[PDB]
Scaffold this active site. Structure first.
Site, mmCIF file in Angstrom:
data_model
loop_
_atom_site.group_PDB
_atom_site.id
_atom_site.type_symbol
_atom_site.label_atom_id
_atom_site.label_comp_id
_atom_site.label_asym_id
_atom_site.label_seq_id
_atom_site.Cartn_x
_atom_site.Cartn_y
_atom_site.Cartn_z
ATOM 1 N N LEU A 9 39.158 36.366 27.155
ATOM 2 C CA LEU A 9 39.879 37.628 27.282
ATOM 3 C C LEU A 9 41.293 37.582 26.722
ATOM 4 O O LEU A 9 41.724 38.504 26.038
ATOM 5 C CB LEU A 9 39.922 38.067 28.742
ATOM 6 C CG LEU A 9 38.572 38.377 29.377
ATOM 7 C CD1 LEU A 9 38.749 38.667 30.849
ATOM 8 C CD2 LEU A 9 37.913 39.544 28.668
ATOM 9 N N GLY A 10 42.014 36.507 27.018
ATOM 10 C CA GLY A 10 43.374 36.369 26.537
ATOM 11 C C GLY A 10 43.747 34.985 26.052
ATOM 12 O O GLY A 10 44.182 34.148 26.838
ATOM 13 N N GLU A 11 44.553 29.838 29.572
ATOM 14 C CA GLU A 11 43.733 30.901 29.004
ATOM 15 C C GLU A 11 42.874 31.584 30.058
ATOM 16 O O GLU A 11 42.574 31.012 31.103
ATOM 17 C CB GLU A 11 42.813 30.352 27.913
ATOM 18 C CG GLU A 11 41.541 29.740 28.464
ATOM 19 C CD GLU A 11 40.432 29.670 27.442
ATOM 20 O OE1 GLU A 11 39.262 29.529 27.851
ATOM 21 O OE2 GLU A 11 40.726 29.763 26.234
ATOM 22 N N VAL A 12 42.482 32.818 29.767
ATOM 23 C CA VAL A 12 41.637 33.592 30.656
ATOM 24 C C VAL A 12 40.330 33.893 29.938
ATOM 25 O O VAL A 12 40.332 34.317 28.788
ATOM 26 C CB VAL A 12 42.318 34.904 31.080
ATOM 27 C CG1 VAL A 12 41.389 35.735 31.936
ATOM 28 C CG2 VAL A 12 43.605 34.610 31.820
ATOM 29 N N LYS A 27 40.987 32.294 35.040
ATOM 30 C CA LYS A 27 42.203 31.767 34.436
ATOM 31 C C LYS A 27 42.128 30.244 34.388
ATOM 32 O O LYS A 27 42.100 29.588 35.429
ATOM 33 C CB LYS A 27 43.426 32.205 35.244
ATOM 34 C CG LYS A 27 44.726 32.256 34.453
ATOM 35 C CD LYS A 27 45.922 32.008 35.357
ATOM 36 C CE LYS A 27 47.192 32.622 34.795
ATOM 37 N NZ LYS A 27 47.282 34.065 35.135
ATOM 38 N N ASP A 111 57.722 40.571 36.132
ATOM 39 C CA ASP A 111 57.395 40.754 34.723
ATOM 40 C C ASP A 111 56.496 41.961 34.535
ATOM 41 O O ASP A 111 55.413 41.847 33.992
ATOM 42 C CB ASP A 111 56.719 39.508 34.153
ATOM 43 C CG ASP A 111 56.840 39.406 32.646
ATOM 44 O OD1 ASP A 111 56.020 38.695 32.042
ATOM 45 O OD2 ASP A 111 57.752 40.017 32.067
HETATM 46 N N1 ZYV Z 1 47.363 40.231 29.597
HETATM 47 C C1 ZYV Z 1 46.128 40.061 30.373
HETATM 48 C C2 ZYV Z 1 45.460 38.762 29.956
HETATM 49 C C3 ZYV Z 1 44.158 38.551 30.739
HETATM 50 N N2 ZYV Z 1 43.244 39.669 30.461
HETATM 51 C C4 ZYV Z 1 42.371 40.195 31.419
HETATM 52 N N3 ZYV Z 1 41.417 41.058 31.048
HETATM 53 C C5 ZYV Z 1 40.575 41.566 31.930
HETATM 54 N N4 ZYV Z 1 40.633 41.241 33.207
HETATM 55 C C6 ZYV Z 1 41.560 40.381 33.646
HETATM 56 N N5 ZYV Z 1 41.846 39.893 34.842
HETATM 57 C C7 ZYV Z 1 42.878 39.067 34.709
HETATM 58 N N6 ZYV Z 1 43.252 39.027 33.433
HETATM 59 C C8 ZYV Z 1 42.456 39.833 32.751
HETATM 60 C C9 ZYV Z 1 43.153 40.052 29.052
HETATM 61 C C10 ZYV Z 1 44.540 40.270 28.468
HETATM 62 O O1 ZYV Z 1 45.338 39.082 28.559
#
Ligand code: ZYV
Length: 251
Positions: A9-10, A11-12, A27, A111
């Site tokens: 998703l994003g 580490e996530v 995460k 933040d």
């Molecule tokens: N800025 C949020 C992080 C983590 N992220 C997430 N997306 C969807 N669900 C989430 N739950 C926690 N982070 C999430 C994607 C974008 O980067």
């Protein structure tokens, strides 16, 4: 170990349970994390990313968090445009609900920005990432903050000129900068300092300049109350809840 990590998703990473097919976000952090976990456990609100569990394997720590399919609010903002006022207002109300809750349990996010405001399937806003969050009230006693934390375009001015400062007005300020972004599709300044031309212009009431020109009078009046240099004069949340634009019915 019943979860398969489908994508980053994003580490996530997005995780889907093999048995239930439920989707959550995980995460992954290899070794602050302890505090984030502690703070998360306290949290239970419909406008805050839910914390389900954590599992530690070896040196790798896993945090299980509510998955927001909507993604970040930041993606809902059109550059130089913003978003329809009614959507901005709705997101702003949900944001205030989240922040009121956090402040109510003595927690400050520190933040607040569109990157950290996530959306679920119904476009419900969820405050995300408590890695920089800290206690500012404990045993009914307020503790002033001293550590400089945040993202420059969103940080309150006192945070840059004060040895110590109140947590709540700082979160209100960042919420004001988020509102500006939603309504103008641009950030007003790199930082709130006098060396910053754009900040100086705002303090001089030059609202014929961008992003202010792009914002209707009603929401801009609220922004005049939030983006106030003196944290003591700055409008508080209970009063934001009484603002005319805040309470204005919208398409
Ligand atoms: N800025 C949020 C992080 C983590 N992220 C997430 N997306 C969807 N669900 C989430 N739950 C926690 N982070 C999430 C994607 C974008 O980067």
């Amino acid at each position: 170990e019943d979860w398969d990590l489908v994508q980053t998703l994003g580490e996530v990473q997005l995780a889907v349970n093999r048995v239930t097919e439920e989707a959550v976000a995980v995460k992954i952090v290899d070794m602050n994390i302890k505090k984030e976990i502690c703070i998360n456990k306290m949290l239970n609100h419909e406008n805050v990313v839910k914390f389900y569990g954590h599992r530690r394997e070896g040196n790798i720590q896993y945090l299980f968090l509510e998955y927001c399919s909507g993604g970040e609010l930041f993606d809902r903002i059109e550059p130089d445009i913003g978003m329809p006022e009614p959507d901005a207002q709705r997101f702003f109300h949900q944001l205030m609900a989240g922040v009121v809750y956090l402040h109510g349990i003595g927690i400050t996010h520190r933040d607040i920005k569109p990157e950290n405001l996530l959306l679920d399937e119904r476009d419900n806003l969820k405050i995300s990432d408590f890695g920089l969050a800290t206690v500012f009230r404990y045993n009914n006693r307020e503790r002033l903050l001293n550590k400089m934390c945040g993202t420059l375009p969103y940080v309150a001015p006192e945070l840059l000129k004060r040895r110590e400062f109140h947590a709540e007005p700082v979160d209100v300020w960042s919420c004001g900068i988020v509102l500006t972004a939603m309504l103008a599709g641009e950030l007003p300044w790199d930082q709130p300092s006098d060396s910053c031309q754009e900040y100086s212009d705002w303090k001089e009431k030059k609202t014929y300049l961008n992003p202010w020109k792009k914002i209707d009078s009603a929401p801009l009046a609220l922004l005049h109350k939030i983006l106030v240099e003196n944290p003591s004069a700055r409008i508080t949340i209970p009063d934001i809840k009484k603002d005319r634009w805040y309470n204005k019915p919208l398409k």
